[PDB]
Every structure is written in structure tokens, then in C-alpha cells.
Amino acid sequence: HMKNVVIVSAARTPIGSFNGQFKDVTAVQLGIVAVKAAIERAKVPVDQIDEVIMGHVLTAGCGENTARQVALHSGIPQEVPAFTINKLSGSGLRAVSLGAQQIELGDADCVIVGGMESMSNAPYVIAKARRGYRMGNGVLEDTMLRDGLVCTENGYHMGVTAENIASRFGVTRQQQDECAYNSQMRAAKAQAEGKFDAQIAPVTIHDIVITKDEHIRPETTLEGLAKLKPAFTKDGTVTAGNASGINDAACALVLMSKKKAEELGIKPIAEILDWASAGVEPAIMGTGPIPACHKLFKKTGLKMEDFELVELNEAFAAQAVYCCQQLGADMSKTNIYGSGISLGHPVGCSGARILTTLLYALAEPGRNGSRYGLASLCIGGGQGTAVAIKMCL
Amino acid sequence: HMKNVVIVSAARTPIGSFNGQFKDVTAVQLGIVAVKAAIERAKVPVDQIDEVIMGHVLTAGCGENTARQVALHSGIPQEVPAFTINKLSGSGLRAVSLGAQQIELGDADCVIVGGMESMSNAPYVIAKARRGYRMGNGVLEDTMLRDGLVCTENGYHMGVTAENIASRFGVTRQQQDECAYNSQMRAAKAQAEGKFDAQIAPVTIHDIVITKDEHIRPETTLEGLAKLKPAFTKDGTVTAGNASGINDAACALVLMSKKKAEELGIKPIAEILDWASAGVEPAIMGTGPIPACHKLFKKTGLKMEDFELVELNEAFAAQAVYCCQQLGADMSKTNIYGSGISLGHPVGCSGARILTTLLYALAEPGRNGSRYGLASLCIGGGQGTAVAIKMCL
Amino acid sequence: HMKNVVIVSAARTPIGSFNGQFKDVTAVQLGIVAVKAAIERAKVPVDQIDEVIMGHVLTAGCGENTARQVALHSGIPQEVPAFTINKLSGSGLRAVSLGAQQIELGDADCVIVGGMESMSNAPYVIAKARRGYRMGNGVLEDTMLRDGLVCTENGYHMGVTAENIASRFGVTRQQQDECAYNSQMRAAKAQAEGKFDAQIAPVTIHDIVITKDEHIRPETTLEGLAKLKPAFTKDGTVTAGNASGINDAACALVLMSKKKAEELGIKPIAEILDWASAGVEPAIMGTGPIPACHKLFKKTGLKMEDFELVELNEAFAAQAVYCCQQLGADMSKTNIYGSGISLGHPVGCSGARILTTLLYALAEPGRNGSRYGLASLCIGGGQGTAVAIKMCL
Amino acid sequence: HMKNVVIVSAARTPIGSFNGQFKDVTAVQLGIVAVKAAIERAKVPVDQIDEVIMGHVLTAGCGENTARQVALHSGIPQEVPAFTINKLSGSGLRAVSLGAQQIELGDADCVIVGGMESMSNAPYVIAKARRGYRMGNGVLEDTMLRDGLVCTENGYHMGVTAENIASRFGVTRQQQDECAYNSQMRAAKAQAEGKFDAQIAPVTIHDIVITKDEHIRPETTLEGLAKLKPAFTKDGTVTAGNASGINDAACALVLMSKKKAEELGIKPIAEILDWASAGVEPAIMGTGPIPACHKLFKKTGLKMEDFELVELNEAFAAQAVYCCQQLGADMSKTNIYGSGISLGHPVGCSGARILTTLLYALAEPGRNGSRYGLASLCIGGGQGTAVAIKMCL
Ligand SMILES: CC(C)(COP(=O)(O)OP(=O)(O)OC[C@H]1O[C@@H](n2cnc3c(N)ncnc32)[C@H](O)[C@@H]1OP(=O)(O)O)[C@@H](O)C(=O)NCCC(=O)NCCS
Ligand SMILES: CC(C)(COP(=O)(O)OP(=O)(O)OC[C@H]1O[C@@H](n2cnc3c(N)ncnc32)[C@H](O)[C@@H]1OP(=O)(O)O)[C@@H](O)C(=O)NCCC(=O)NCCS
Ligand SMILES: CC(C)(COP(=O)(O)OP(=O)(O)OC[C@H]1O[C@@H](n2cnc3c(N)ncnc32)[C@H](O)[C@@H]1OP(=O)(O)O)[C@@H](O)C(=O)NCCC(=O)NCCS
Ligand SMILES: CC(C)(COP(=O)(O)OP(=O)(O)OC[C@H]1O[C@@H](n2cnc3c(N)ncnc32)[C@H](O)[C@@H]1OP(=O)(O)O)[C@@H](O)C(=O)NCCC(=O)NCCS
């Protein structure tokens, strides 16, 4: 295991709906809210920060190296280096494990990690404006599809990759809608019971102060879902009611060496034990969590049943159900407060977001299980990434 | 310092000029050429590759997670994961150190690292086409400037940060042009004497085979540079003649553990010793190599004089002269075959590119210096990154 | 004056607001509605139609020669020719006089005239996409401003030409708002009392049937207008409240020789007597009706006092008040049911639209004035055009 | 016949190739060259001008009412009114007959008529930038096709309408290429013999002075043409060698009443006798000249064989051959100096251009035929327009 890496804080913005409450807010701006919050919760002096690593997928028109922009505007000294990564939906979680690597090697004693995404403000592009089209029409490309949600390999939406999982693996419409229903009910109940209150950092729009995850649909019913029309294929199983949302949010965590945390008198929340990534066939990219988790299990000597709580992102109900079946997930310990379907899925953010939700869930009074947590998600182009943690108490 | 990381191969495409010989080729296409070449030169079985990490800055419209596209189309199994990283001009060098970190930690035994950029095919963006402009003009933004060459913090060009270095630190027009002149002459001579022949991997365009760096200008004279008008400020010192080019290329290296290389019968070319990044004031971003190298020296106990050869990227002569002065570079051992001014500067590629040139330079018959190599470059937003190598012989 | 030209029918669509009830409908679609209605009201056999002339300003992206599209989709034989005409806000009125000229000369016995505009669907233009921008930002131009509402000569808005009239000729903010207020009240009352019912041709949207002018604001008060901020200049007088609307509509009339009407058994509604256009200084374009009407008076021997009703388009209250003062209008006989401020101003349509409103107004039971009608409007680039009619009874 | 209308002067710019010699010159700017020249050749005092009427097809991004822009910048007083028309390729010739109508009715004693077109600078548009695309791609529309060269009715290029003429009417490839060959040879010989010298007005590009029609191909051969690949349909007959060019030019004529010309001591060049337009099936829009000419013949009592010279625009060789066959054209009197194929076809200009070429041809010493001239062209959407003249001597 990594032996020297702890999480000392975490924070996420509310999750906005597509063209919703954060439509007038950049990914950088959401990123700043989250990082400022993470720094304050850790009580880390900003001159102890060694690096900032942020996932961000849809970067067109956002300006230079968005991680660096966020850092400079969260009160982090200009002397601290920063870079941005893209592993699509894996981005925010691979940012965390890259940061953990920095600390475990002794290249850093404190790293800010996270992810951000404003899918609302992914722009449109034209490919041939530099040297000209000469004659004939061109395409006005939605970068959220071109550079995000469309499989570059196959030329179809991620939602078709979900239908592939449905076809090949026999995940029925009823199963998908059941998963979707449970996710909404869980998210609604969690919200109403204050389960998200502490982890959320409010976003002030200069004024309106946004505190609530706006994508949850508490009025969701099994019958309502069954009426919906397929979204990606005619006579399909995947709908808008059982696919993840398109959303806007950011999320950040402060990582530290054990020795640095001790020196600053900062209480460690959790250790990071290890991480893994793995590739799969792009056409069934939803399966990525399965080899990613297996690899993580071989590196750590853990098994699925050892985890007290598990976050496996719901990109599509077809995907989430298949992953949970094959890994032998306990659904009473997996995605307990909803996930991508209910809360939403801002793609560069979600990897750090699910780790943040896991951490706060496991930190709650009365959690006296194994104290191990697992986070994993699927990734367009056919990948998965995962991280194991153990709470410190 | 790192004890277990070796470079076993390196390759780069030739470097195209802006809107030049690679205008019809994508970043991803160049990446594939470089990665295939690196793999062939290593003789590494593709099922021994653990991860791919590629730097790439101007990603708008290029499709999903371009490192993954490159891997899949270079014959690497779908099971291998990949991610893309943006540290502007640092990207390709930071990709190398991130990959080294994988191996040093034992998370991987073989990683593909590098970078790629097609500045020619960076698209134009429309910011408010999703929810509408309503009334009134918008901006058609050139992503190469918005997301690349314009300082998001100051809102002026990288060239103006070059002027700032000239203002504050008194690097004169004449000094800038001498540097530029020597760069052009060094590159011309190197290209004529065959110095780049082995490192270059030819690009086939469907048939034309491209084998040569396009951007070098052997006709350059001190008297010609002196007549050029300032490109960034009225009555300025920075000109198209003493500024790096805008360019297209890709570059890749194969890294391995010493153990895996020994297992496979593959001979190491160089050890990676260590790395360092650092931040500076965005307005004088060109100063970034100075703290990055000092931090690297502090981590390794090396000094500038210990290097046999040095690659410090010439983003602008003003910047390069200042860094070399401040670091006490021996110009007979620094940038001996030219650099960004002459060879060109495809921003996401250059960090790996300079390391490949350094490696092949030090590997020439007749070299018998320290066998230590230094690569560093400056970064928009005020950063530097650096790597130290030692040839294996 | 003309001795052989009669109007036998007229129809207009309701007038939509900007991005309003007709946002999903093309100019051509509205044109078809109006032309079909006009043809049905005339009872003219379509094989008796000799030509179609339609005004239309913002034609970008609408396809080929839109008058011809309208004719073909209104059931007019392919054998009938058509052309489109642009005199900005004059277009639809100049279309009428051009058609009258056909008949007076004996080149035609029956012509379809009118105008159409969908300011909502005027597109955005990219100027250098054919041969390339090469490097550097461009402009995404709103064609409604570029090709419509911005003075190409001065490079400022039509609203600023309105300010110029206020500066030079001292039409005060209070005067502007009184005009605007009376316009809104006149239109509200007219619409409520059924005045527009017969002239309007309903628009079916595939089902929604649209029958009502959208833009009127019956809640307008002198006190409300007085609180509005200037829309075109800092510390100006012209506001969104005392300025014409941006709007969508179409309007058509059927013109015939007296001989053909008598042959077909079709009863004439009005004679067209004559027409006139004139130019003025672009910077005070709102003054255009003054020389156009004087030239018309000179050609006809009529005077302002001889008209029973007058339509002088309210492009801006500043402009309308100045014209009415200079021409000695009787405001109890001028714009009696509102005009551009209240009903709205779809620029290529309005010239025909005001003539249709004038015609139906004078045709009301109980009218027993001179039976002479005057229509005129101002034109960007510094023009006016006018038509005089006399009802047949 | 019209009895009171004469042409007192004419002028045209050279005709530029697509993205050629006038690529950096607007339609307005070419228009100004032509109008200034026409005014000077007439020696008409500018305060005797009553109206300006200019054809112009592709008006996107050109600014307000381009006829008015041209007038103001050709030294015509601001008091003179102007409008722009669009009848696609008919535009420039219908402008002439509309102007003649103004004079014959006694509404004007002097009118400037013409046409202009910069097909090079027709821009690209996006249809849904005002209210947004929300999600998914859009189209970047080439307005030269959308609003120009594509049949809006059928959704295919004008070149397909030419293939329709070829299919239905049996105009072979060999016939088309023969027509094309003859057109090039005629144009080359005419140019080389100075036949275009007087009519051309030189265009100074601020410096290079352009005097030559640049589209002519004197190296054209029957064999060369036979090698060319179809341009519009697979296994088609229509090629780039036998279709009109895409081009840039302008052209203007001064018209006057007989009485006004006498008063000013301006010698009339030709009388305009009459005009006609007619519609046809859009799919065979090339046939438009046939009914247009027939109608003109019935109005005038002229027959085809009465014309000393004839201009029938070559939009496509298939079109021109069919029109000439059906009208019984003498090819030794028809298109004697080439036409659309050789000289080019700037669409809003060509209608006035062919009348200008006709007028100068008939004015040459040694032309002592009937003194009657005919001009006619086809029009997308299925129309034709024609004008008859008689030289005065
Ligand atoms: C599926 C998708 C295309 C739908 O997007 P959308 O149409 O913008 O979605 P909306 O939230 O507006 O919902 C669409 C409709 O579905 C219905 N709907 C959605 N969720 C529902 C629910 N829980 N119950 C009932 N109806 C529901 C609604 O009727 C809604 O229309 P309405 O609210 O205007 O009446 C989009 O969410 C998507 O692509 N998701 C996947 C994202 C993804 O691939 N991420 C990466 C994965 S690795
Ligand atoms: C400086 C810059 C704007 C020049 O762009 P450009 O104008 O397209 O450059 P070109 O190579 O076409 O040079 C323009 C002219 O300069 C002249 N020129 C350039 N190098 C010359 C040399 N060595 N000798 C003589 N003249 C030279 C030429 O006249 C050339 O015109 P040409 O086409 O007739 O040869 C651009 O190179 C730039 O922005 N560079 C910096 C990139 C950067 O910031 N990277 C990131 C660093 S962190
Ligand atoms: C003036 C102009 C810029 C206003 O455009 P806009 O801002 O889209 O106009 P809106 O109708 O949305 O008005 C903006 C605000 O003004 C206020 N307003 C407008 N008319 C009002 C009235 N009668 N009473 C009170 N408030 C009024 C409202 O607050 C409105 O906001 P809302 O949406 O909450 O009602 C535009 O109408 C214009 O350019 N007009 C002139 C067109 C022209 O030049 N034509 C050619 C003439 S030759
Ligand atoms: C047919 C059309 C699409 C071709 O446009 P284009 O490809 O840009 O044309 P070019 O002038 O570049 O010629 C294309 C190729 O044809 C060949 N060519 C053209 N004319 C030739 C000739 N006379 N002899 C030999 N080769 C010829 C050339 O090889 C040329 O390629 P190259 O010169 O680079 O070797 C275009 O001219 C067109 O659409 N014309 C019709 C316009 C129209 O419809 N107007 C309205 C009518 S109502």
C-alpha cells in the first residue's frame, strides 16, 4: 500500500443541471469555489502547498491550463506549479491518484487535487476557419459531444455503448429503470436528511447563493420511467431517466504526507491505500470499473466485500448494474446516496466528487464497519479508474 | 533521486511549419507516428506496456482523450490505460516525469510518454452558440491564442511576457538577435551534418514521405534580424525573427524499469534521475526554468556545470538569454543544434522533443563528457519544468 | 398621376415579437401566409398573375430569391416571374410602387406586392471562413445589425440617428415618451375593438393558430417610459420604450389594372395615385419622409391636410414627432392605431403593412373624409419613400 | 415599344476569378468603380441623377442596401434614392429594365442601373446562434451555395439543373464541350484584339491596376475538355470546363430620357425598346430565356433573326446550346466574344455585363446590320429575363 498519503479535507460545489443554475459560471469559477473551500477545511497554510492537479475534460475556450487559473485565484502562491489532466470521466479520480503518487515518492508533502466541468459552457467549434473552406458547407461542432460524450473510436454516443452493455449482457429496461428509481429515491432522501450539507461548498452568483444539487428528481416513479422514450437507439433500453445527467460542478481535496500533517497539527481524515487504471473495449466502455477494481484488489489484497461503502459512478443504469453484478457489490453499501443518474455527472469533476461523497459518508457517526472505501468509474474510449481508502478515525 | 527508471527509446516526427507540410494531419496522427516509432525502436512487446501519458495543449475538436486515441491506433492493446496532460509548453516534459513516477513507485514497469501538437489545426470557437447571443456580435476566437499563446491572467501574448523580460532584465534587441542567429546557424548545420537523421521518424502522407524539419532559416543574418519590425509591442524588441515558431509535431519515448528492461533483453539508453516544476509571475513566465532547475539541482545535488549538454527551450531569445545568464549556462553546451526559434515550438510536443534531441546528441560516438543531461522549458501562466538524465553507455 | 392601378386585396400576418411567437417560422413561411390570404381575398385566378415583387432585407441563409420561393409555395404557377427588393424599411412600400409601375405601363395587368421579415431568424456571419483567418480572432456578426439596423456609413445604430434628430431638432425625451405612450394606447384600443381582425391572416404553426399582434404593451405609462434607461447613448433620450420593436411578419397586396379587375368581376378597394422616394443625410435618416412626401405632393398636387388618414412609420418617437411636426400632420388622423413602437417594425414588411392597415382603416363603415391615404416611412442610409392612395368606395 | 428611354453610357470592371485578383475587394467597391466610370463616360452632372438601382445576389455581411452604399461613394448626392434587387442571375438585367420603366413613366429622367457581385466574399453563416443550438451539431453554411447556386426548391446545384437539360433534351457532352471550346477561343481572340478595351474600367488595388478578364483559358482544347471529370453527377456531362465560372465583377449603365439627353447635349448610344420576364420549371431553370425571349418578341414584333447581335448568357453549355437551338439563334451573331464559360459569371453583375458587351460590340465601326440587340439569361428557381435595344448611331 501507499504508506505516506492522507486526505486532510474535501469540498464540492452543488451540482447544477445542464443550462441550469451555473449556466453563467465557468468551470474555473466552480473550481475556485471548491479549492478555496478545501483549503479552509484543511486549515493548510497556502505556502505549504507543493502542486495543484485538476481534471477537466471540455477545455475549449477556457483559456490556458485551467488548473493554474484555479490555483492563482484560490489564493495559492504563484510559485506553486499546476497542471490539468484529461481521462474523460476518470479525470477527477486520476487527479487524486497522481497527487498521491507525488506524495508517496516524496516529491511533494501537500497537493491539491480535484476536477471541474462546465458542460453548459462547452463551446462550438469550426475546424477549417484557419486556412478556409474554399467552397461548400462545414460543420459547427458541439465540443461536448465531439470531445466528450461521443465515442471517437465508434462515432456514436456513450449512450449507445450503454445499449451495447444492455444487448450483450442482458441488462433489461426494467432493471435499468429500477436502478434509476432507487438512485433518485436515495439522492432525494440523502438531500432531505442533510447528508450532503457538510460536503457542499456554497456558490454565490454575483446575488443568489446556491446550496442545492438541482438535478435530483424526487417525483421519479417506476411507472414514469417506463413511459420514457429511448434516447440513443430506436427500440432502445436507455432513456434520459436511466442515463446520467449532463451537469456542472467542481470538487477538490487536500492531500498531505502523514509527517506534514503531524507537523501542522492537521488531523488526517483517510489514508489513500492505492489506485489502478485499466482499459476495455470502447464499445462497452461501461465495463471499465471491472478490470480497474480487480487490478486494485490484486495490488492491495482487498476484496469487494471488504469495503464498508462503495462509489461506482452511474454513467448509465445498464453500466452500473452490470458492474455491480460482476463485482459482487452489496447494493446496501454501494451508491447509498445516489450517483450520476440522480445527482448528475459533470464529467471532469465526478471522479473527485464520488470520492468526496464517499469520504463524508464514511466519516458520519455510526459508521463502524471495516473503514475501507472504494471509488471507481467508467471512461469513454474504454477505461476505468479506481482508488481505495481507509478512514483514520 | 530515482533509481529504477530508464529510457529505452525515443522518436520524433519532423517539425512542420505553421500551415505547412503537416497542415492536413491531426495532432493524433503525428502522435501515432512517434509512438509507433518509439515502440519499434525499443523492440518492446506491446502487451508489456502498462500506461500511455501524452502532453497535448490545443485539444478543441480533436475528439476524446487524445492520448488514448494515439495508443489504440499505435497497436497498443485496448487493455492499456491512457491519459492526456496539459502544462502548456511543459506538457510533453511533465508527461515524461509523470511516467517516470509510475515506474519509480512500482505501479508500472513500462510507460509510453511524449507529446503532440497541431497548432495549424487548432480550431476557432464560438462561446455562446449553445444558449444564444440573442442580439449583438460575438467573437470568433482562435483557440491557439485563447487556449495557448495568450496569457489568460494578463490578457496579452506570450511575446509580451518576453518584452517584460527585456524591459525588466535588460536583454537587448541585439542580444536577442545574436541568440536567434546562432540558433538558426546551429540548426542548419546540424540538419546538414545528419544530426537529426536517426531521431526523426518519417511521416507518410497519403504518397509523400516527410523527413525534414521545415522551419529552419539558414539564410538568417544579424543584419536581417535587425531590420525586422516588433511583433508584439510598438517600439519593442521581440520579433518573428527572435521568437519561437508556431509548429506541428509529435514525440514519444518508451520508459521502463531497469528490471523489466533486463528481463526483456532491451538495452537502456539513459536513466531519468529526477524532475522538478516551479511557478513564477505569469507576466515574466519566461523565467520559469530558473527556479525549476534550481529546485532540480537542490533535489539531485547536481549543478549547471555538471551537465555535458543542456536543452533550455527557446520560446523567445529574450527569455532564453536571461535563463542561460541566470543559470550560468555554457552556450557551447546549451541548445547546440538550435531550439524553438529555429527548429520550431509545437507547444505540447516540445518538452519531449528537446529531451529526444538531448538523448540522441549525448548518444553520439565521440561524446565523453559527464554523460549528464538537462532539459527545461518555460510555461505560460508562469511555470517551469525540468528533467535530469544520465546516459547509460 | 397613375390612372390604371387599383388595390383589390390586402392581408398581413400578425406581428410577432423578437424571438417570440414566430421564432420557429421563416420569413418565407410568413410571406406564403400573407400571399395566399391576399390571393384568396381578391378571388383572383392564379393564372392571371403576371409578377410577384416582395421586399425583404435580412436575406442571409434564407435560400434563393425569396419572393420566388413565396410565389411557388402560394400556388402561383411556375410560369409567373418574381424578384426580391431591398430598400431597408422602405422595401415593402417600394415593392408596392414598383408593382404599380408595371401595371401603369401596361407590362402587367396583375401583380402581387408586399414584404416579409424574420428578424428573429437573421443569422450570424463569419467573414473570412472561405480563404481563412490564418491567425487571430474574428467577428461573429449579427446580420440583423450588420445588414439591417447599423448605419453602414456612420457605423452606429439607427437609434443613434434617432438621437441625432433629438440633438439637432430638439425633440425632447418627454415628447418622445408622449408619442410612445399614445402609440401603445392607440394600438391596445384598436386591437381590443376588433380593428385589426379583418386585415390579419392567421398563421398556423404545426397545432397552434396565431391571430394576435404580440408586441403591444397596454400597461405602458408616461411614468414608466420616463424611468427607462437610454438604449443607444449615455445620457440619451431614445429608449426601448420610445423606439420601434424588432419583429417578425409579412404582408401582401394584389394590384390590378382597372381593366382586368372589371374583366374578372373583382371590385377595387383603392386606386394607387402616385409614389416618391428621396434621400437625406444618413446620420439623420429619420427625416427621410419629409422630402419623400413633399416630392409626392409636388407630383400629385395633394397637400398633407387633404389626407383622411396617414401612416408615417414610427421607427423612433424622435423621428416620428419631427416628421409629423415638419409635415404639419394632424395627429388625430396620423398613426391612429399605433405603429412601429407598439405594433412593431419587421423591417422588410412594414412598408406594405402600414399600407394594409391604412386601407382597412379607411374602408371602415362610417368613414366619410377625403378618402385620400398617405403612407411613408424612413430608411437607413438616409432615405424616405411614400405612396398616396384614394379609396374607391 | 418604350419610346423615351436611351442608354447614354456603360462600363464594367474586369472579371476576376474565384478567390483571384479581386479576392480582397468587396462587391460595393467593384460597384463604385463601375458607376464612377459610367458617370464619367456619360458626362452626366451628378445632380441630374434621379435614382440608382443595382442588382446584387449574395448580400450577407455586405452591410445596408448595397446600391445606396455604391451611390454615396460614387459622388452621387445623398438626396438621390437607391435600392438593390435580387433576381439571381437576372438581377443586373432586371435592374436595367426597372430603371427604363422609371424613365418611360416620367418618374425619372436619369437612372443609374447595374449589378455587382463578389462571390469570393460571400460569407458563411450559422442559423441558430441567436437562441442557441442547446445540444448537438449545426451547419456552417456557404451562402454562395445556400443563397446562390443551390436550387432551394430541389436541394441540388444549378449544375444538376444543367444535367436535367442534358438528360431530357439530348444535349451531348461533345456538344457541350464544343460550345465551351468555341466560347474560350472567341473570348481569347476578342481580348487579344482589344474588343474589351473600351468597355472595361480599370480597378486599382491599394498598388496594382487590374485591366484584364482573368478567367479566360486560351489554352482550352476539345481534347482537354473531354478528359475532365463531371462536376455535379457521377457519369454526368457537365464539367468545370463547360459550366460557367464563379467570379467577381461589377457593371453600370446610365439611362436617360430622350428629352433629358437632348437638354444636356449627351449623345444617346441605344434606345431600350422593351423587356420581359418569364418563369419555368426550376429543375430546368436553364430554359428560362426561351419564354422570356418569346414574350419579348410578342411585345415588340421582333423575331430572333431580326437581331444583329445577341447575348444569351452561358450559365452552362447544356443550357446555352438548348436555348440557342430552340430560339433559332445564329451562332455567328450570338455570344461572339464568349460568355459565362470563358469570361465568367458574377451572378448579380452578369445581366448588366452582357448588355454592356452587346452595346460596345454593336457600337463598333462596321456594324451596319439591323442595329437591334438582344440580351437574355437564365435564372435559378426557373426564370428568364430579356431586353431588346436598338442602336441610335
Ligand atoms: C440522455 C440525455 C441525452 C438526455 O438529455 P436531455 O434531453 O437534455 O435531458 P433532460 O434532463 O432535459 O430530460 C429529458 C426529458 O426526459 C424526461 N425525464 C428525464 N429524467 C426523468 C425522470 N427521472 N422521470 C421522468 N421523466 C424524466 C423529462 O420529461 C425531460 O423532458 P422535460 O423535463 O422537458 O419534460 C443526456 O442526459 C445524456 O446524454 N446523458 C449521458 C451523459 C453521458 O454520456 N456522460 C458520460 C458518461 S461516461
Ligand atoms: C512571432 C509570430 C507572431 C510570427 O508569426 P508569423 O508572422 O506567422 O511568422 P512567419 O514565420 O510567417 O514570419 C513573418 C515574417 O517574418 C520574417 N522572418 C521570420 N523569421 C525570419 C528570419 N530568420 N530571417 C528573416 N526574416 C524572418 C519573414 O519576412 C516572414 O515573412 P515571410 O513569409 O515572407 O518569410 C509567431 O511566430 C509567434 O507567436 N511565436 C511565438 C509562439 C509562442 O508564444 N509560443 C509559446 C512560447 S511559451
Ligand atoms: C431598442 C431596442 C434595442 C430594444 O431591444 P430589447 O432590449 O430586446 O427590447 P425589449 O422589448 O426586450 O425591451 C427591454 C426592456 O425595456 C422595457 N420596456 C420596453 N418597452 C416598454 C414599455 N412600453 N413600458 C415599459 N417598459 C418597457 C422592459 O423592461 C424590457 O424588459 P422586459 O423583457 O422585462 O419587458 C430594439 O427594440 C431596437 O433596436 N429597436 C429599434 C429597431 C430599429 O432600429 N429599426 C429600424 C428603424 S429605421
Ligand atoms: C463547376 C464549378 C463547381 C467548378 O469550380 P472550381 O472547381 O472552383 O473551378 P476551377 O476554375 O478551379 O476549375 C476546376 C478544375 O477544372 C479544370 N478546368 C476548368 N476549366 C478548364 C478548361 N477550360 N480546360 C481544362 N481544364 C479546365 C482545371 O484542371 C481545374 O483544376 P486546376 O486548374 O487546379 O488544375 C464551378 O465553376 C461552378 O459551380 N460553376 C457554375 C456556377 C453557377 O452555377 N452559376 C449560376 C448559373 S445560373
Author numbering:
A (entry chain B), B (entry chain A), C (entry chain A), D (entry chain B): 0 to 205, 211 to 397
Verbatim from the authors:
Among all r‐BOX or RBO genes, thl_1583, which encodes β‐ketothiolase (MhTHL), is identified as the most critical enzyme for the carbon chain elongation mechanism in M. hexanoica.
To determine why the MhTHL‐modified E. coli strain produced n‐caproate, we assessed the structure of MhTHL at a 1.64 Å resolution using its C88S variant crystals soaked in a hexanoyl‐coenzyme A (CoA) solution. MhTHL exhibited the typical topology of a type II biosynthetic thiolase fold with a tetramerization motif (residues 123–142) in the loop domain. Although the crystals were soaked in hexanoyl‐CoA, a deacylated CoA molecule was bound to MhTHL in the mF observed‐DF calculated electron density map. According to the catalytic mechanism of the enzymatic Claisen condensation, the S‐to‐O substituent of the covalent catalyst C88 and the second nucleophile C382 were positioned toward the thiol group of the CoA molecule. The experimental X‐ray diffraction data showed a significant electron density for the carboxylate ion between the main‐chain N atoms of C88S and G384. We theorized that the map position in all chains of the asymmetric unit was occupied by a carboxylate (acetate molecule in the model), owing to the thioesterase activity of the C‐to‐S variant of thiolase. The positioning of the C88S oxygen atom in MhTHL differs from that of the sulfur atom of the corresponding cysteine in other thiolases, with a ≈−37° rotation of the Oγ‐Cβ‐Cα‐N dihedral angle. L87 and V351 in MhTHL and the corresponding L87 and V352 in CkTHL modulated the pocket size to a greater extent than the valine and isoleucine residues in EcAtoB and CaTHL. Accordingly, we suggest that the Leu87 and Val351 residues in MhTHL are key structural features for determining the substrate specificity of biosynthetic thiolases, providing M. hexanoica the ability to produce n‐caproate.
